[PDB]
Every structure is written in structure tokens, then in C-alpha cells.
Amino acid sequence: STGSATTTPIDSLDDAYITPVQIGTPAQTLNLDFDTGSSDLWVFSSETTASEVDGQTIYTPSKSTTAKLLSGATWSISYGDGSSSSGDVYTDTVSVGGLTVTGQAVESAKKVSSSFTEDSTIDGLLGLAFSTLNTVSPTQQKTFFDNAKASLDSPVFTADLGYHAPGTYNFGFIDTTAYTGSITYTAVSTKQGFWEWTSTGYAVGSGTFKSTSIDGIADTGTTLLYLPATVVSAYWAQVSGAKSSSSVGGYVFPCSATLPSFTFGVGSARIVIPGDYIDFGPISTGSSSCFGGIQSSAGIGINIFGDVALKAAFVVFNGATTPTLGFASK
């Protein structure tokens, strides 16, 4: 089997991407944030505290003839941005782009933090990291990908995120029309439960490439590119008037700037992030200070190849017995 679903930016900045997901019988379609940095499929639901729901579509398990309470199971998750959610668990039928899993753990939120409530466009998360990170207790649950894997034509999914445009998540096949040149594959460590890999270095604009190992994660659920402070300083040094602002919480730059590209290495290959991808617009409405898309990972404890980086590539998440990542230009 295979599946193929379109993923759509939630706003004009590509702050996140939503993908429609069918849950239950008859189908209840929710727009979920596919997150390769976490391993829980959780939804706004009929159980979510009413004051914490503001515009999201909810899953109502009592209206699904295939929903079953997973008795005694609870979940609770905290993300890198400080947000959180928790609740109880149902199993139900979940379909993505025509690919169906029966008996998927659907984690029903009883509580969500303010950032979730305030984002009316995201109805929940669908985690695509390794199932070792799943938070369900006392019986850890599998991701949608891990449950689909054995049925897929190939044990892979691919992320093809758009810049200010829709893109695609495919499951079980590699669309050879969706990228240019060849895919470069690179090793993955699953030791922290992430799609963790080592970039071979970087370049700023038309500058020379710096060969240096940068360990980090491929994380579709993180907006920005978070790299070591040395790398990030070298980037923003090429933008007149850019500075790190402790008040704003990262590098800002004059909105009048034209940003340089940023290149990262994948083995001997190179992925180029155009400068425009690094502009996250005014820090507050009408400001002439703009927020940068490349930020320091200092104090986060891991480098994160988030959407800014991934949207410049066609990315293969290879879930074979030995997982690997692939990157192609597009």
C-alpha cells in the first residue's frame, strides 16, 4: 500500500504545515501537524476542556463506530517550545492520503497549553519520530508510520514541504518526479528516538564551504533551523544590521535586507536554502525589525533541521531495519 497527502502552510510565514487525516467511522477529518520530532498522534477532542478549544475541529470518539477506549492508558507530552498536552487514549481507524491503519492509538486531549488553543488551524499532531518516544502509559503505543510500515510497498515516508505553498507527505514510495538529481542518503542514530543525523558542513551565501560535523535532527514540527552559535553568528555577520536580541529571543535583522542563502552538507551533496526562506517577517506587526529563520541551538541541547531547512529539499525518512535519511534538491 501507499498513501499521499497534501500538506499546507498554516499562515503566510510557513510557521507550520497541516495535513488532513481521517479518523474513525464515519470519517472525521482533522488537520494535523505531522511532526518527525515526536511520536504521539494526539487530537483536540470532545474531551478537551471547553475553555481550551477555540476554533479547532474536534474528534468525537462516541460518534465513531470503530473507536475503543484503550482502558487505563494516559498520555502527557511537553515540546521544545514549552507547549504541552495530555489526556486519554482510544484506538480507531486512521487514514492518511488513502493509507489506512486499523487500531491506531489516537490520543484524545483533555488539556492543551495556551499555544495550542491559540492556533485554531492545528487540530492535533501526528508524530513520525521513533515509537520509543511515545508517551502513552502504561503501554507505549506505535506511531502511524510504525503501524503502517509492514503494509507499505517500501518502508519509507517522504516530506516535500513547500515554501509559501503546499507540499506533500508520501508513505510507502519515493516519487522520482518530485526532486532533481539524485537522493543522498546519510546515517541515522535512533538513540534519542529522533531522525538524528550528521551534516557535513555549511556555507553562507556564495562563501566557501566549511567542512564540519553538525549532529542534529530532521524535525518537520519545528519551524526554524537551529544550529551551533558559531555557525549562526557566521551567517548573520553577512547581514548588515543583524543582531541577537535577548528581548526578542533571537537574531533579528532589518526588514530592508536581502538575506544570503545558507547551504548545508549531506555527505558530499549540498542543499541550498534560499535567503528568502530565512525571512520570518516583522517581529511585531508594522515593525521594521524582522525575525531570522536561522537561530542558535545553544541551550536547546540539540541542533534542529526544522522546516526552514527541510522545505529546501525532498526528504526521505527510510524506516528500513537500519533507518537512514535521504536528501535531494528540488
From Swiss-Prot:
Family: Belongs to the peptidase A1 family.
Catalytic machinery residues: D35, S199
Residues of the full protein shown: 90 to 419 of 419
GO molecular function annotation: aspartic-type endopeptidase activity
Domain Peptidase A1: start-end pairs: 17-328
Keyword Hydrolase: yes
Catalysed transformations (reactions): Hydrolysis of proteins with specificity similar to that of pepsin A, prefers hydrophobic residues at P1 and P1', but does not cleave 14-Ala-|-Leu-15 in the B chain of insulin or Z-Glu-Tyr. Clots milk
A biological process term (GO) from this entry: proteolysis
EC number, as in UniProt: 3.4.23.22
Protein name: Endothiapepsin
Disulfide cross-links: C255-C290
Keywords recorded for this protein, A-Z: Aspartyl protease, Disulfide bond, Hydrolase, Protease, Signal, Zymogen
Keyword Hydrolase part of the UniProt annotation: yes
Top-level taxon: Eukaryota
